[PDB]
Amino acid sequence: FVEMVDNLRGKSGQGYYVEMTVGSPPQTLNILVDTGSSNFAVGAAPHPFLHRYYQRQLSSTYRDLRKGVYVPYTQGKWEGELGTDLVSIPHGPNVTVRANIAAITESDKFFINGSNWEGILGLAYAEIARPDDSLEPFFDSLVKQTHVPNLFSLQLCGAGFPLNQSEVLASVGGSMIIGGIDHSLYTGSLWYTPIRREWYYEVIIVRVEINGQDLKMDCKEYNYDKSIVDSGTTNLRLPKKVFEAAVKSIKAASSTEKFPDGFWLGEQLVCWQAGTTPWNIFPVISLYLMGEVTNQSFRITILPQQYLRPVEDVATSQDDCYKFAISQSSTGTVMGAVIMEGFYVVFDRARKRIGFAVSACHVHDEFRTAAVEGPFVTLDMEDCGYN
């Protein structure tokens, strides 16, 4: 497992990626690690944002499937040609496998300039794969063709200050442990919530507290129409009602200070002189998740240092500036990178569950520390799932 530590480069605003290789001879590519989709896909042609791409013609071993494919994400979409080829993760356990690969031909709002990846790795389940559920996703292939156990874990650490985008490519920001857990990347106990159904990594949230006060909503609202865990999405995304309540609550907690309302829409920035960010006036958020045992939940607690994402200032100064990283969703709750960054997250596919633990890498508050804590008692958790 040690060979796999630090095998991820990137950040929450543009994605975390892992080195992989495709074809014989091996072509090296940076591939974005996305638990919110199930298709492995690469640039196979030149494009302004791409430094390199996949040349099937050079592959000794590219087979072709003479089939086409389209994926749409919440943001961005691409289109292309299914084939198969041999794939390795140089960091990743050294079993080479044959896997489905989409070769991207047309794309809209999908490649990000400077992000330094050239492709995407969907680690979610087959039912969501395009064009349909018989297109075996990468990780299903890896499990079926090798002795890699059926789980992986993600420690994302991002935004040490002050971040430079190229530099992030230079110095590491996380770990994907393929086929196990590395006990040295977290402290405390792992707490597990069930994967409710195997498509997106879908969980059930059963309470939400802000600075210790319950939002007092029907918990179905928290999962309307699903809650999922998604390394491929930057923000914490909340259903339209929940989001309104959080914001109302967060605005009130921080009312002493002055913000545009368009900041609270996640578009505008805010800024303070270096080292004067008034962290204390921003509340912690507690998401209580369904546990493994009857009537039992646990909570994960999130600091403002995760939901206020650092960005480089437009009028360039020595300011600390931040985009607000909770946004409205209409497609369910999404526990994105910014929430995952506090934690070591186990995708325990084998036991259909997801584990959380305090990361060895976490943002530090002088007086507040984010924690994964249980057990809590919580009646009628099944109600909370939407239908």
UniProtKB/Swiss-Prot annotation:
Belongs to the peptidase A1 family. Disulfide bonds join 157-361, 219-384, 271-321. The gene is BACE1. This is Beta-secretase 1. Changing residue 225 to N: Almost abolishes beta-cleaved soluble APP production. N-Glycosylated. Addition of a bisecting N-acetylglucosamine by MGAT3 blocks lysosomal targeting, further degradation and is required for maintaining stability under stress conditions. Acetylated in the endoplasmic reticulum at Lys-67, Lys-216, Lys-220, Lys-226, Lys-240, Lys-241 and Lys-248. Acetylation by NAT8 and NAT8B is transient and deacetylation probably occurs in the Golgi. Acetylation regulates the maturation, the transport to the plasma membrane, the stability and the expression of the protein. It catalyses: Broad endopeptidase specificity. Cleaves Glu-Val-Asn-Leu-|-Asp-Ala-Glu-Phe in the Swedish variant of Alzheimer's amyloid precursor protein. The chain holds residues 60 to 446 of 501 of the full protein. It is found in: Cell membrane; Golgi apparatus, trans-Golgi network; Endoplasmic reticulum; Endosome. The active site is at 34, 230. Its EC number is 3.4.23.46. Glycans are attached at residues 94, 113, 164, 295. Inhibited by RTN3 and RTN4. Expressed at high levels in the brain and pancreas. In the brain, expression is highest in the substantia nigra, locus coruleus and medulla oblongata. GO terms for biological process: amyloid fibril formation; amyloid precursor protein catabolic process; amyloid-beta formation; amyloid-beta metabolic process; cellular response to amyloid-beta; cellular response to copper ion; cellular response to manganese ion; detection of mechanical stimulus involved in sensory perception of pain. DXXLL motif is required for a proper endocytosis and retrograde transport to the trans-Golgi network, as well as for regulation of lysosomal degradation. GO terms for cellular component: axon; cell surface; dendrite; early endosome; endoplasmic reticulum lumen; endosome; endosome membrane; Golgi apparatus. GO terms for molecular function: amyloid-beta binding; aspartic-type endopeptidase activity; beta-aspartyl-peptidase activity; endopeptidase activity; enzyme binding; peptidase activity; protein serine/threonine kinase binding. It is an enzyme of class 3 (hydrolase).
